[PDB]
Enzyme design. Sequence first.
Site, PDB file in Angstrom:
ATOM      1  N   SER A  59       0.767  -1.232   0.000  1.00 55.36           N
ATOM      2  CA  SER A  59       0.000   0.000   0.000  1.00 55.36           C
ATOM      3  C   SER A  59       0.803   1.290   0.000  1.00 55.36           C
ATOM      4  O   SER A  59       0.197   2.349  -0.193  1.00 55.36           O
ATOM      5  CB  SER A  59      -0.960   0.032   1.179  1.00 55.36           C
ATOM      6  N   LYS A  62      -0.005   3.366  -2.914  1.00 55.63           N
ATOM      7  CA  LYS A  62      -1.100   4.323  -2.935  1.00 55.63           C
ATOM      8  C   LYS A  62      -0.613   5.769  -2.969  1.00 55.63           C
ATOM      9  O   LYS A  62      -1.335   6.659  -3.447  1.00 55.63           O
ATOM     10  CB  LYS A  62      -2.035   4.095  -1.751  1.00 55.63           C
ATOM     11  N   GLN A 115     -10.937  -5.230   0.222  1.00 53.61           N
ATOM     12  CA  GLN A 115     -10.570  -5.970  -0.988  1.00 53.61           C
ATOM     13  C   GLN A 115     -11.791  -6.232  -1.832  1.00 53.61           C
ATOM     14  O   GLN A 115     -12.904  -6.335  -1.313  1.00 53.61           O
ATOM     15  CB  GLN A 115      -9.934  -7.321  -0.637  1.00 53.61           C
ATOM     16  N   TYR A 145     -10.856   1.952   4.929  1.00 52.35           N
ATOM     17  CA  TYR A 145      -9.656   1.742   4.113  1.00 52.35           C
ATOM     18  C   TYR A 145      -9.951   0.684   3.032  1.00 52.35           C
ATOM     19  O   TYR A 145     -10.459  -0.401   3.355  1.00 52.35           O
ATOM     20  CB  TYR A 145      -8.524   1.328   5.049  1.00 52.35           C
ATOM     21  N   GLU A 266      -1.036   9.926   4.854  1.00 49.16           N
ATOM     22  CA  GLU A 266      -1.758  10.268   6.066  1.00 49.16           C
ATOM     23  C   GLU A 266      -0.805  11.076   6.938  1.00 49.16           C
ATOM     24  O   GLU A 266       0.380  10.741   7.021  1.00 49.16           O
ATOM     25  CB  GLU A 266      -2.200   8.984   6.761  1.00 49.16           C
ATOM     26  N   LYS A 309       3.039   6.367   5.505  1.00 54.66           N
ATOM     27  CA  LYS A 309       2.224   5.336   4.877  1.00 54.66           C
ATOM     28  C   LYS A 309       2.827   3.971   5.161  1.00 54.66           C
ATOM     29  O   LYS A 309       4.022   3.755   4.961  1.00 54.66           O
ATOM     30  CB  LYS A 309       2.096   5.543   3.360  1.00 54.66           C
ATOM     31  N   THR A 310       1.968   3.037   5.585  1.00 57.48           N
ATOM     32  CA  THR A 310       2.303   1.622   5.674  1.00 57.48           C
ATOM     33  C   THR A 310       2.015   0.889   4.365  1.00 57.48           C
ATOM     34  O   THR A 310       1.139   1.288   3.583  1.00 57.48           O
ATOM     35  CB  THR A 310       1.464   0.939   6.776  1.00 57.48           C
ATOM     36  N   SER A 312       1.782  -3.440   3.023  1.00 58.16           N
ATOM     37  CA  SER A 312       1.962  -4.834   3.365  1.00 58.16           C
ATOM     38  C   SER A 312       1.442  -5.721   2.237  1.00 58.16           C
ATOM     39  O   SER A 312       0.398  -5.442   1.672  1.00 58.16           O
ATOM     40  CB  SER A 312       1.149  -5.145   4.623  1.00 58.16           C
ATOM     41  N   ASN A 337       6.027  -9.629   6.390  1.00 59.24           N
ATOM     42  CA  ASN A 337       4.892  -8.771   6.743  1.00 59.24           C
ATOM     43  C   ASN A 337       4.725  -8.766   8.260  1.00 59.24           C
ATOM     44  O   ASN A 337       3.838  -9.425   8.811  1.00 59.24           O
ATOM     45  CB  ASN A 337       3.635  -9.255   6.018  1.00 59.24           C
TER      46      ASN A 337
END
Length: 356
Positions: A59, A62, A115, A145, A266, A309-310, A312, A337
Amino acid sequence: EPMANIVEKAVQPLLEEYRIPGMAVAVLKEGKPHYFNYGVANRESGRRISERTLFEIGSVSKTFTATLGTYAVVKGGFRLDDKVSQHAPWLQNSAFDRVTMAQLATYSAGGLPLQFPDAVDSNERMRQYYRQWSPLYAAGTHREYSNPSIGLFGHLAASTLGQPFRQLMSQTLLPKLDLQHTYLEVPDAAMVDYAYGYSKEDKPVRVNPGVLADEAYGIKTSAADLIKFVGANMTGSGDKAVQQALAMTRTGFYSVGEMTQGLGWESYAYPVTEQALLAGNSPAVSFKANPVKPFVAPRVMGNERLYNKTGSTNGFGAYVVFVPARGVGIVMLANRNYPIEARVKAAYAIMRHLAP
């Protein structure tokens, strides 16, 4: 108190507890990158992790998608407040007559899920999914999210410039950003650099792409390239339209606790407490719909702030943080992860040293 020791102190507990095979850390401070590498890219090959190793960033993609979207805004393809159906006539009479492009990007369209359902496995089934979707919430009122949400944003943004998303990303945005080791699909010549992921069952894995993968989670990049992208987001790109695109991702639309949702990134006021940063990246935010605290006007968020931002995937865990006013950024890429809360705690410790 040398940087090297601070990074080791923060990283070793991650390597220990989560048995991380390989991790690349890049720190940007005072205009210079510093690289700290740990372990192996592939347990069945000799090459060690370096700042050139390619990881799946999940992600964190993004943020690239958001930047492509704001580039399309700069180039006149759409306005953030346009209804989605203005740019998708196939969505006339759907929920998307009342959802804006910005709400797609900020996961606030009204309950699109994390998803796609696994049956959505073709372009036609994707189109039908969006046509049929019945909202859970009024547009703008709840953050959930969502890959279908920001995926559609990226897909439609590219459409407004008359190009496929992959083409616009690979031929326009990444070259203008001067990112030469950043890919939606790793080419044959770069396979030598591409790490394998290691799943929670300790098996070697790679992302098999699905619907809107490019937009939602598909970037492979190195710590060296990703810290260059972080630098572009602090001291700028020399491409004027790309700079406008980068800046526009700082537009905040609402808050959830101490977090402000922008486009991809974010952000938090800086100084920021560790507690606040943990909460904003916790399942209470990422795994439950949250009613937002809305802005009358979208607002460019400032320099005295921490952006993050994360990301995974199956077998990979990434985290990126930066504070523009301090000129400090951190990239942490791993082929495990491992828990987001652990990423946050480690990055927080490093950042507190870099920007006391």
